[PDB]
Amino acid sequence: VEYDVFLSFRGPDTRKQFTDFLYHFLCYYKIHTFRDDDELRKGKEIGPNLLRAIDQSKIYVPIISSGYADSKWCLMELAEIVRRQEEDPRRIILPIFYMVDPSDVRHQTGCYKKAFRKHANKFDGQTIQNWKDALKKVGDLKGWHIGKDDEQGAIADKVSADIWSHISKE
DNA sequence: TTAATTAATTATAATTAATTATTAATTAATTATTAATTAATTA
Numbered sequence: 001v002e003y004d005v006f007l008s009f010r011g012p013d014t015r016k017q018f019t020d021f022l023y024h025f026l027c028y029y030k031i032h033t034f035r036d037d038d039e040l041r042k043g044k045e046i047g048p049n050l051l052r053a054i055d056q057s058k059i060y061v062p063i064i065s066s067g068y069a070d071s072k073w074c075l076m077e078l079a080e081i082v083r084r085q086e087e088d089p090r091r092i093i094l095p096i097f098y099m100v101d102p103s104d105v106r107h108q109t110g111c112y113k114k115a116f117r118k119h120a121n122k123f124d125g126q127t128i129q130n131w132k133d134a135l136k137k138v139g140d141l142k143g144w145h146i147g148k149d150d151e152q153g154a155i156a157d158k159v160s161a162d163i164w165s166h167i168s169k170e
Numbered sequence: 171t172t173a174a175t176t177a178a179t180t181a182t183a184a185t186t187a188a189t190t191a192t193t194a195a196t197t198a199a200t201t202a203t204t205a206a207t208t209a210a211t212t213a
Binding site: 039 | 178179180181182
């Protein structure tokens, strides 16, 4: 009746490209999945929607993309995932890199440089250091890299069971 | 459906400007005295 898996991704990039199939494939294993498309903006952080499901989730599974560092709504939300995780280690994180190196995520260089080249003219000089401290630790856990040739279909089946193995056996 | 105003939101790109680099290549000049046999002479 509650949520056992909570996703997070980019807007226009992978909302129909691949994450959509995983939502439809996952529902075939009899588990309730949460994905959201509402652009929020109704304020700066909504409570009864995101904040509710965050504490209700069980396996936070982000999906870092190529342009995941531009939306001013994703990063600060990810800062709430990995922060809540460090307080109670009962839950886990299974990131999935996508079309990007597992090196442009630990130092925000490469395809993120100019993203933080303009993000530094608006916000505080400490809030940005809060993101780069949280975004870094995500790029150290285990994760299926998806190269240019790997099957966008076989990976889904392999990763889904790893989410279903931690539920049946508990 | 249009025109018009207000309110926000999202973009990368181009140019100018500066610092930062031992390497590429030839020229030129100096420096390296044996290798080697031949010729001549001597023990």
